[PDB]
Amino acid sequence: KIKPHGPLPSQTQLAYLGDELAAFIHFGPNTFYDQEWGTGQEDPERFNPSQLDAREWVRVLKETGFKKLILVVKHHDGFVLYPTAHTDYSVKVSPWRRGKGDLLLEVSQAATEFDMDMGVYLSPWDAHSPLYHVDREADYNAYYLAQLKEILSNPNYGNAGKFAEVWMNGARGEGAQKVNYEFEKWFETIRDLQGDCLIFSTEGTSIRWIGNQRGYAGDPLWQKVNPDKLGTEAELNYLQHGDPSGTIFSIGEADVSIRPGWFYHEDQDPKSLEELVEIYFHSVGRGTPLLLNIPPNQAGLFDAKDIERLYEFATYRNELYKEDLALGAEVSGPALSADFACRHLTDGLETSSWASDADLPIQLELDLGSPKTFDVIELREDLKLGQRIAAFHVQVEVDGVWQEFGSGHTVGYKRLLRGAVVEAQKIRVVITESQALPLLTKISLYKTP
Numbered sequence: 001k002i003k004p005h006g007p008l009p010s011q012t013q014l015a016y017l018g019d020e021l022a023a024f025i026h027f028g029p030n031t032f033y034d035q036e037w038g039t040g041q042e043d044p045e046r047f048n049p050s051q052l053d054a055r056e057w058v059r060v061l062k063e064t065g066f067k068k069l070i071l072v073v074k075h076h077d078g079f080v081l082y083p084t085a086h087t088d089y090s091v092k093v094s095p096w097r098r099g100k101g102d103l104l105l106e107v108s109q110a111a112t113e114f115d116m117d118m119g120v121y122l123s124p125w126d127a128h129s130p131l132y133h134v135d136r137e138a139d140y141n142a143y144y145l146a147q148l149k150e151i152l153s154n155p156n157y158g159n160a161g162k163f164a165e166v167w168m169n170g171a172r173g174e175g176a177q178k179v180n181y182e183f184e185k186w187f188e189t190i191r192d193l194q195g196d197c198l199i200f201s202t203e204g205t206s207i208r209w210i211g212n213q214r215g216y217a218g219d220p221l222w223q224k225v226n227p228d229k230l231g232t233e234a235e236l237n238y239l240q241h242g243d244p245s246g247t248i249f250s251i252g253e254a255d256v257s258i259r260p261g262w263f264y265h266e267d268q269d270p271k272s273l274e275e276l277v278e279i280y281f282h283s284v285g286r287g288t289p290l291l292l293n294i295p296p297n298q299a300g301l302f303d304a305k306d307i308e309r310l311y312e313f314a315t316y317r318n319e320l321y322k323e324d325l326a327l328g329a330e331v332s333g334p335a336l337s338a339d340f341a342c343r344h345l346t347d348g349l350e351t352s353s354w355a356s357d358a359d360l361p362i363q364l365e366l367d368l369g370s371p372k373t374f375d376v377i378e379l380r381e382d383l384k385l386g387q388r389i390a391a392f393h394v395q396v397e398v399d400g401v402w403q404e405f406g407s408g409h410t411v412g413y414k415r416l417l418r419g420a421v422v423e424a425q426k427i428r429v430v431i432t433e434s435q436a437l438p439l440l441t442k443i444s445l446y447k448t449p
């Protein structure tokens, strides 16, 4: 047995890492007011997306490879997109669905049918509620907690009543009241109602912000942090890289909009395939999930360009992963024992691993049997035993001469490393630094389409 190193991910963390892709949906008054941030004075009368089709949202997201949908149910403007008992500023007083509308219900039913996991975004900062005030702090917290209970206990909400993520945005406007939140109480309610549901927050929860909105994870990306270094004035670069000494497993989630804004604006176009590809490589390709926001329009529908783009993106990835050129390749180098053989790097088994206790740098050489054309290499650690690798690089033998392909810091759950297209039969993976004896479960090679 190899001894585990560092903090270990929960089962729900590993599942998210394996799922790789989650979708964000920002829809609400701001959609009708053509804005990114609302005041709380938006007229509920304007809110009438009669064409809204949540099943269409879910169907397209499922067909284009998303595994989770995080729904904004109350943005900063404080308008609530389900008929909560706790405020009259909700869809209840709007014309939508003749006043009997429930978006969380509509989405959850669709998500249930498609087995799409569900997350929920409830804004801590609330620009509408008169309870959002330093002298009503207990009252706002009780209002917030009340809605968490409404959302998380109702078997009509979620994917068959289950939520996979709760999102607690840290953003707050310059002018706003300095309300402090009852974090522990919220977290306990979430564990009561939803077990080990993942929680994105500014505190030491299971998910953290990566510290930017471009969908850019750092390299290194340590999926762990010291809770002491979090909070609302966590360093952006600390978020972006995590902590090589971190004491809790933490997913640095890469959130980004397919458009310049989080909400839909008519004058904006979605990002190009090329752009989405770059993002993909710097999120999923750095061992962290991509959370792509797709904002429905005034009609309540995904924009046609956006849908098309989502298909192109799916096609791209499908083509990318179609043939693993390293599958079955012969690998030489040191190995701890037969149970940790080199051959476990290309055996197609995520349950088999290579490992070596030899002195660094450790070199694995792959022989593909014949020259192949590729421009991506994939590596994966066994995070059940902890994240370890701190530095590595990759060399390819071209025309009898070893040349640099690429290099990186962390591997993590899964690392993709692009390089210039090469035709090569032999490949070297050189591990230069590791926090403990390195394990790898997989090395793969692909050609981008």
Ligand SMILES: CC(=O)N[C@@H]1[C@@H](O[C@@H]2O[C@H](CO)[C@H](O)[C@H](O)[C@H]2O)[C@H](O[C@@H]2O[C@@H](C)[C@@H](O)[C@@H](O)[C@@H]2O)[C@@H](CO)O[C@H]1O
Binding pocket: 026, 036, 168, 169, 170, 171, 172, 202, 209, 212, 213, 255, 262
């Ligand atoms: C430091 C800061 O507040 N920056 C603003 C963004 O807030 C952060 O958002 C991230 C997620 O990207 C995370 O919640 C942090 O805790 C926040 O501090 C802000 O974006 C906010 O989050 C988006 C996903 C979206 O819902 C947006 O409407 C929300 O305000 C953006 C908004 O343009 O401004 C940043 O300056």
